[PDB]
Design a protein around this ligand. Sequence first.
Ligand SMILES: Nc1ncnc2c1ncn2[C@@H]1O[C@H](COP(=O)(O)OP(=O)(O)OP(=O)(O)O)[C@@H](O)[C@H]1O
Ligand SMILES: Nc1ncnc2c1ncn2[C@@H]1O[C@H](COP(=O)(O)OP(=O)(O)OP(=O)(O)O)[C@@H](O)[C@H]1O
Ligand SMILES: Nc1ncnc2c1ncn2[C@@H]1O[C@H](COP(=O)(O)OP(=O)(O)OP(=O)(O)O)[C@@H](O)[C@H]1O
Ligand SMILES: Nc1ncnc2c1ncn2[C@@H]1O[C@H](COP(=O)(O)OP(=O)(O)OP(=O)(O)O)[C@@H](O)[C@H]1O
Ligand SMILES: Nc1ncnc2c1ncn2[C@@H]1O[C@H](COP(=O)(O)OP(=O)(O)OP(=O)(O)O)[C@@H](O)[C@H]1O
Ligand SMILES: [Mg+2]
Ligand SMILES: [Mg+2]
Ligand SMILES: [Mg+2]
Ligand SMILES: [Mg+2]
Ligand SMILES: [Mg+2]
Lengths: 179, 147, 351, 260, 51, 354, 123, 278
Amino acid sequence: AHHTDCTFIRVSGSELVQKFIGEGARMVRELFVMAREHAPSIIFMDEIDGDSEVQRTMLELLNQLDGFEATKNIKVIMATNRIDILDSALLRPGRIDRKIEFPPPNEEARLDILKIHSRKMNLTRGINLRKIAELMPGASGAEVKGVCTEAGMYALRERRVHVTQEDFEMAVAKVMQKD
Amino acid sequence: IKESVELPLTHPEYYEEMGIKPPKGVILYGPPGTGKTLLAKAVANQTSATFLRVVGSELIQKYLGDGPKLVRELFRVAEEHAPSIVFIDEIDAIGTKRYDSNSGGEREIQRTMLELLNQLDGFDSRGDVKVIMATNRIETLDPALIR
Amino acid sequence: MKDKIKENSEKIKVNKTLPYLVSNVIELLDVKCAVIKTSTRQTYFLPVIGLVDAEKLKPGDLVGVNKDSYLILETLPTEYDSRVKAMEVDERPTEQYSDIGGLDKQIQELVEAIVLPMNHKEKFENLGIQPPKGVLMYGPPGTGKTLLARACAAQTKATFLKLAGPQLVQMFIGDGAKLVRDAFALAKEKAPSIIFIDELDAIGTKRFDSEKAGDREVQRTMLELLNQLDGFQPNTQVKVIAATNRVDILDPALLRSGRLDRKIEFPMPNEEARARIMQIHSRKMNVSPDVNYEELARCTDDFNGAQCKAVCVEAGMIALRRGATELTHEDYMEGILEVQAKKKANLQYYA
Amino acid sequence: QSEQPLQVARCTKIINADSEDPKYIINVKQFAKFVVDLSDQVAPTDIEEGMRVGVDRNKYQIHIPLPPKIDPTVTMMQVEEKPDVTYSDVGGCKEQIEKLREVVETPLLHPERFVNLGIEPPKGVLLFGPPGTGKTLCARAVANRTDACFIRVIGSELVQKYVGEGARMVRELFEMARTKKACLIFFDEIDAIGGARFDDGAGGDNEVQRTMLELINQLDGFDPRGNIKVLMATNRPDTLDPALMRPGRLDRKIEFSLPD
Amino acid sequence: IDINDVTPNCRVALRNDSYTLHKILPNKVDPLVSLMMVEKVPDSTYEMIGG
Amino acid sequence: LTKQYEKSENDLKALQSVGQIVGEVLKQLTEEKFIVKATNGPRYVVGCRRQLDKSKLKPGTRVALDMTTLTIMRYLPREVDPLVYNMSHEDPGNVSYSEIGGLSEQIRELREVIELPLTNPELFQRVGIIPPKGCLLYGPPGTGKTLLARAVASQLDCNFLKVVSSSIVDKYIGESARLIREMFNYARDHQPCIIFMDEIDAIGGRRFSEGTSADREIQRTLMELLNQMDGFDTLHRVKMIMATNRPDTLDPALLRPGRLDRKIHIDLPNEQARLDILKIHAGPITKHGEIDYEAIVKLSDGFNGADLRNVCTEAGMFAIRADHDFVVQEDFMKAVRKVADSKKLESKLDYKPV
Amino acid sequence: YEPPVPTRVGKKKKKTKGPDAASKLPLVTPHTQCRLKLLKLERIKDYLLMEEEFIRNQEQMKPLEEKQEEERSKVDDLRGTPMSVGTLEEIIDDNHAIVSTSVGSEHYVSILSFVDKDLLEPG
Amino acid sequence: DVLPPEADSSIMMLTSDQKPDVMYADIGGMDIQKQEVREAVELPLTHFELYKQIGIDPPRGVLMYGPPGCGKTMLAKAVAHHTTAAFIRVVGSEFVQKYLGEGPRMVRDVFRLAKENAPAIIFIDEIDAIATKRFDAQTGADREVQRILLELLNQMDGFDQNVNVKVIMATNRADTLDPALLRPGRLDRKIEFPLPDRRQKRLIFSTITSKMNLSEEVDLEDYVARPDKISGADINSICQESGMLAVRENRYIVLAKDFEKAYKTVIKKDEQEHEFYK
Ligand SMILES: Nc1ncnc2c1ncn2[C@@H]1O[C@H](COP(=O)(O)OP(=O)(O)OP(=O)(O)O)[C@@H](O)[C@H]1O
Ligand SMILES: Nc1ncnc2c1ncn2[C@@H]1O[C@H](COP(=O)(O)OP(=O)(O)OP(=O)(O)O)[C@@H](O)[C@H]1O
Ligand SMILES: Nc1ncnc2c1ncn2[C@@H]1O[C@H](COP(=O)(O)OP(=O)(O)OP(=O)(O)O)[C@@H](O)[C@H]1O
Ligand SMILES: Nc1ncnc2c1ncn2[C@@H]1O[C@H](COP(=O)(O)OP(=O)(O)OP(=O)(O)O)[C@@H](O)[C@H]1O
Ligand SMILES: Nc1ncnc2c1ncn2[C@@H]1O[C@H](COP(=O)(O)OP(=O)(O)OP(=O)(O)O)[C@@H](O)[C@H]1O
Ligand SMILES: [Mg+2]
Ligand SMILES: [Mg+2]
Ligand SMILES: [Mg+2]
Ligand SMILES: [Mg+2]
Ligand SMILES: [Mg+2]
């Protein structure tokens, strides 16, 4: 949405943001008025994981976008933890046009994530981020990002300015093993 | 579907000379992806009447009585824009899906169902409002609804 | 000085002109001085209270103040909700204890706990016992519960505050609690007084522990009623009548032996009572002197008083249906079938 | 210029009504509370406690008694255009129709034949049967022929968001019905709110049961109902509360069985 | 003030007594921008995505 | 009358006076400029009288302002809420502990929290503990929770705030939570003080996760109260007595030992406790013949204190029914049996805090 | 005192919505371009000429205060500005009703003649 | 005129006399919680430049959540007692006022007062009163609380990295909190205050009992080793109840028998578990 200049709308179903969507609030399709005004638009719902309200909102938005929506360039996205919990209505062919998998980062992908987030810290030269990536098997990007943030914490605990390799290793042990 | 939503409007003389009001309601049922919503899209393409589309899951509300209120308000707008075609797509989703946001449980859904019973065929006189319902699970509907 | 006093009183009248602005006294300070809160949601301090003695004012007292200078001009009567004031009966229904059949024991259990303490209060002081506090009348529908309440109001000169359970159930939090504590406050000021809460199960539903949702507002209204029946301030001058159909739904704290001392069970009318009930509701009716009410009572097994009354009402329909000016036994016999409401059947192959 | 605007206020208490200086305490909605006196053009006996009045903006003196406040939703529940269905459009329901008319139509049309014999006609009819049997069709025929006020109530319309509304709407429904010499209230699909009371641990249907309890109280309670003859239609009469299915609230149980 | 510039959901200034529309005030925060401000989804680009 | 003229003349002078707006000082800008806020209204930049002290106008001080100029006229003490005033000036009924039977152990625990710490603070300081500040009286209905509170309010020489949670609930926005603040502010300013909140489950119920707007406002009142029983500001010389027959529905935070340190169980009377209550209530009853109180106790199993009083009442009712001026053991025998039948309509009573 | 009695039957607005209003010209049949359609259209044209001449004559000798632009200009004066938006609560009489402002305060006001009385319903 | 920023604030800071007497040593067995609070509240206030040099973004707010009685409010008392910065204690329920607008008005007054007197700490106890995720648009209570919550989000959003104000929220029902409050930049540090562990129980027992005159015969390990899942308030109650039994017997020294009776009284744990399940 940032690169295609598409308006990014996050639909969490929160009643706090309901006054902005509309005073009616009876049906979730009332947000389409704000979506058409900001076309191209990307409507994003994340399922934190009764029945799922995010998946319910998917059906209402997808049904309108099928052939009953005049304005084009209104895309919709769902983020879910698992694909086998989805309703059969969403899993029906023709409803979701593409399903993209986000596997946990492997050794090389973790290094790329480690390289991205460690650029926001005062790093001593010669940090072997490859070893730190190897020390985090089966970790997510958020966990890798949190390891960097905790690595800077350990520098502060020793009142240091530059983050050393020991700090990253101590951060890996705390984030993964302890937590 | 044409004789219930298209022919009565384009050629009302056929019904009048025969002495019968057109078939009141219609429901499209079958396996998913069979073309139930597509036929309504074709119906909406070649209709001179106002087309109102509501998914059955939209009738499940967060507060007591708003479910019946929304059904009551949906058919009021249909009466204002007469003639009109009301497409209640995925009608079975009102009962086959349970959400915690719906304060009342199955009992509030039943009250919403009873409100829809009144709108389809009740005390109030109905104008030129044609109702189309779609469902892939017709066995889960209340038989009094599709009577 | 007599002319000066009269002339001063004339200037008093010009300032004391209507309309007054209703306010409530919040406080009485010394440096003789009063703080009032107007009905316009404004708090004012009065250096001098006004045309009312400071000793006669207490916090919360309703006063009428000047619309401009906000000084207290006079004291107003205690304020009760218009809904509470509208549930006090003034017509005094024309029922009688002789219009109730088969509830002699139930009537006696109610009169001796409600009317006897008010009239013959000496039988309790001499015996050293406390009069019963609250009477609950429970039973199947149509047993004559509300009817006895009308008879109690008919044959009692005390103030009677009719009331229904749903009337104490309101939108706003505490609104139902205010109504309950206003009804008992108004009943106290018109003592001796009787309060009849029909359909107690509307507010008396049992409390429960839940994590997601619950009817905490209605239980708050009931908890206020639990105070009024027996709370911190013992209110032994107001008699309470309670009627419900499902005593199993009621909260155990409501059915306590201090709030509802006597729990009178209203049974299905027996063979003797049913004949009496049909005779009662056929008084204003031209009934032929051949009706066997004993036979009709034998034909009305599992009938409450309402169905027995409906038999007489329905029998009049049949006499009008066939044009007869007098009700016969056959009209009563066939009117039982309509009240029985048996479903249509072709059970002619039996026997 | 001649007709000045009047603020709607509710009288609360009459002070010194016996004397020649009766002071009236009024509740001016959300504005304020005032102790006022009556205008010179209104009789002292025409204003009673708890009734709505019209007051001026200068001295707030009561100028005109007003009708009691009634929910606009409840007002719209009364029928103003009679349906196009007559009793000739109902077939196979002969005996059912006579029983329905002789309770809800005959007493209003020809009341003289009931007072003379000391007859109190039934004031309630329950129409029950499977869907499509003609329960609402016969009710629509009743409204077309009736000349008294006909109010149509749907049980789903009595289900409301807040606590005590359904009972409140029933109270204003009968309050508005009592302002007429003869009235008819039709409760289509009473089973929406007429379900039998139960205790399921949690607050299962507690609010809706209170709505039914209020309706039961108005039909047969301490106060007389009035000249209202109610008409209930449901396809699930087995779910109705026993106290609602009792004579004095639903005196006649007309069954719309499948036609022969 | 031109009537064509009076757009729905615009902020305007009205006189004290007549309430006459006499000035079009700067537009308020867009409801979507207000909605997305509380959601506060972190802004991202392709450079901060690895693997 | 000369005195009549003085009173009549006093009214004429009193009529010329004008009411003053009550506000609250927020901050003193200059020596002659103040920021004050109306009690229910806007905040203003106002002046002050020269003759006023201007040192007693600390921020938060209640002040009276001129209606026209809004100039500060005087500083007033902290306002006492009329509801809070009615709480303090509520008559308990002159109840003595001798009118309570079978609760001697329970009375001691109650008097160990609210009596000894307020009379002998140094006794607990020497050990090294802070005495408990809150106690909960829970039990089946009719066991004597309210009677005990009335007795301790009638006998203890201390400031007592008597209120029920259902009488504090107000429909206005934040009014109910405001009442709790004024309740404890009165207690803080009138130390030593005791707050009795009968039927605490009216506002002290478990916080709903999916409740209504009405529920949320009640919970805000609860956690306002929770912030005063045990919050940032320590409560000193203020004791709370809370009574409920359904402690299972109370919030875990309210039942926490930091707020309700003691959970005194006013249980149903036992064989000896039932006997004691009977003599309390059957005492003033006129009777001839031997009264076998033990026989009543055996048939009184499961009764509460109110039931045993009903036995005494119904026993006299049988005497009045038979036109007697006295009650015999037979009349008691029917009364205890008649009440026993009435106990079959009562649902589960055994509810305990979790 | 006696309660005012409305002359209008019912409390609801007129069912018809969005009509041709004064332009409800008759359905001249047939649509075919023949003589009687010309004859039928001429009769519509004739009465309009009669209508046009009559209306012009009345307004010509009507007082300067009573003019089509003057009365409409006057109507704004009776309405004034601003025009507060309220809610209709109850129709007491033909020219009297209870309305509530946005602040929740009800007023017993008088319904002026120029208001479309057929559009008035509670709520 | 333009009034001074520190003026026009219904909420005041904590004066010297209003500082709580609770010390860090008064709190026992919350080293993890103390470190997280210290690293997120009091260390950024004094070492903001060290954070920027390393590259850490200091957390604007801290949410302290856990079961009741686990040292949430008390740690805030210890922070206020041991801080060189201004402390603004407030309750969530205090923001809800009858006067519409006064609620959101005093939300920004707290943040304006904190911004003017930086460094400052804003402690909002019982945050659920104004941070509930459910709102009803037809009720004045939820409409006003929604305005209060929206202002609270706006006030925290309007604080850049330069302004040295730390916000602390405490709650025991964090499951009911609106997720918008926990977004990055508003409350980026969620510190959990769980029930004390066995090691945490002994430190809690030792600290409270250190202020009491005990006898050498009492062994705190007898009650520490108990498998009861009790909070710090429960342990305080056990010690508090032990001291009253000594007081009742006119004793100024707590014996072992008092602790045994106090522990049984305070815990009063119904079994609630049947042996046939294991
Ligand atoms: N018989 C058909 N002929 C042509 N296209 C069809 C046919 N059936 C389905 N399709 C295509 O399938 C697409 C998706 O199916 P559609 O939305 O109509 O499903 P449906 O039958 O309404 O089922 P459901 O709502 O249960 O998933 C339509 O847009 C249409 O292009
Ligand atoms: N025992 C009786 N004797 C005479 N009339 C009776 C008796 N029982 C019932 N009735 C008649 O039944 C009708 C309704 O009775 P009532 O309203 O008192 O019922 P209820 O038991 O209070 O009902 P519910 O509990 O369902 O409200 C009255 O007309 C009354 O005369
Ligand atoms: N006895 C009858 N004679 C003629 N037509 C009938 C009869 N019964 C039903 N109908 C027709 O069937 C339709 C069914 O609608 P109706 O309102 O009668 O149903 P109902 O009994 O109220 O059903 P539901 O229980 O679903 O509300 C009527 O509109 C009418 O056209
Ligand atoms: N121990 C007791 N000794 C003497 N009388 C008692 C005792 N317990 C209860 N009673 C009597 O019971 C009646 C009601 O008791 P009380 O008002 O104290 O109820 P409670 O325990 O607070 O019940 P609830 O749970 O309903 O509030 C009073 O008349 C009182 O005299
Ligand atoms: N680690 C600890 N050491 C000593 N005392 C403790 C400890 N943790 C909690 N306490 C005790 O907890 C009591 C107060 O609890 P506190 O207010 O800190 O908890 P909380 O989590 O904020 O409470 P709530 O969630 O109910 O608002 C004090 O009496 C204190 O002695
Ligand atoms: Mg489809
Ligand atoms: Mg009754
Ligand atoms: Mg029907
Ligand atoms: Mg009590
Ligand atoms: Mg705390």
